[PDB]
Amino acid sequence: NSVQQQLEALEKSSGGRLGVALINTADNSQILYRADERFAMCSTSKVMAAAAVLKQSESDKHLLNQRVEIKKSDLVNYNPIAEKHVNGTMTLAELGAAALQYSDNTAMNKLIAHLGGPDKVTAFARSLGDETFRLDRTEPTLNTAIPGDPRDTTTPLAMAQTLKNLTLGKALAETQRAQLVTWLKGNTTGSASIRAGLPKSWVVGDKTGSGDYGTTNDIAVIWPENHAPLVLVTYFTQPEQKAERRRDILAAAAKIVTHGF
Numbered sequence: 001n002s003v004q005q006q007l008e009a010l011e012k013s014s015g016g017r018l019g020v021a022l023i024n025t026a027d028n029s030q031i032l033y034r035a036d037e038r039f040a041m042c043s044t045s046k047v048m049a050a051a052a053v054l055k056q057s058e059s060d061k062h063l064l065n066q067r068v069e070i071k072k073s074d075l076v077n078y079n080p081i082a083e084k085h086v087n088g089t090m091t092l093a094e095l096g097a098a099a100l101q102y103s104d105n106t107a108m109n110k111l112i113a114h115l116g117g118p119d120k121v122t123a124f125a126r127s128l129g130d131e132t133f134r135l136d137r138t139e140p141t142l143n144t145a146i147p148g149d150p151r152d153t154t155t156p157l158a159m160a161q162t163l164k165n166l167t168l169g170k171a172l173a174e175t176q177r178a179q180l181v182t183w184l185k186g187n188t189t190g191s192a193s194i195r196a197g198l199p200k201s202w203v204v205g206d207k208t209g210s211g212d213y214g215t216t217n218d219i220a221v222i223w224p225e226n227h228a229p230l231v232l233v234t235y236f237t238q239p240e241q242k243a244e245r246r247r248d249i250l251a252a253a254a255k256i257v258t259h260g261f
Contacts, residue, residue, distance in 0.1 A: 014236070016239070017037070019037055019039050023164055025228045040146075040151075041135075041142075042211035043208060043211075044217045045133075050111060051172065053092055054096070063092060066091060068095060069088075070106070074106050079105060082106035101188055102189065109139050118137060118138060119135075119136075128166070129165070134154070135152055143211030145211040156235050163220075166180060168229055181221070187206050190218055193250040193251060195251075197253070198254055198258055204223070205221045206219060208247075210245050212241055212242070214240070217234065218233075219233045222258070227261050
C-alpha cells in the first residue's frame, strides 16, 4: 500500500472529504491528496490575520505593543483569553498570541478590525503570492463551512505553501518570522490533531481549525530531530451540518505521510 493508497483508504472509511498537503523542505517534494480542492479554513485562517499584523509591525516599531480596548460587547462565542481582559486592554501582540495559541475568536475579530476588515487579510495573502486564500467574514460566521461555499476557504496546497513561506520562508522579516514560529510552537489546542500522529519528541508548531459540517483542520510546521522541516496541512469536512469533528483522522493522516522521516 503506497502512501496515496493509504490516504484513499483512510478517507473511504472516514465518512468525509480529506485534504492533505505535505511539503518536505529537504527537496521540496510533496505528498498531495485533494490538495487543490477548497475547504473552509475555520480557525486556521487566524494565522493569516496574525501574520498580516506582523507584516505591518515591520514598518511600525510601536504596533505590537499598541493597546486595544476589550469591551463586553466585543465578546463572541469563544473567548478564553479576551474574557479575562474585559474593561481592560490587550496589546496587538497579546491578541495575536491569544488568537493563535488558544484560538480566541474575539482576538481574531480584533485583529481583523485593526487591519480594516476581512478583505484586508485577503489582500495580505495575495501579497504573499497566495492566489487561493480568501477571508470573507469575521468570527463566528466564518465557521459555517457549508459544502461548496467559497467564502473563507483555501486549498491544502495553497495553505501549505504559504505556511512554509511564513514560518521558514520569504514572507516575513526575521524577527516577525521568529515570533510567528514561537506562537505556533506554543499552541495549546492541537494535542489530538497532527501532533498525535507524530513522534512525541518532534518539535511542532500548529494552528487548528474546527467548524460546522464536522470540519476539522490543522496546519503545522514540523521539525524532525535529524531531518529538514516538513510543512503539513490536513483539512477534513463532512456532508452533514452537525457532524462531530474528527481530529483522529488528522492524526491518522499525519502518521501516514510522515512515515519514514
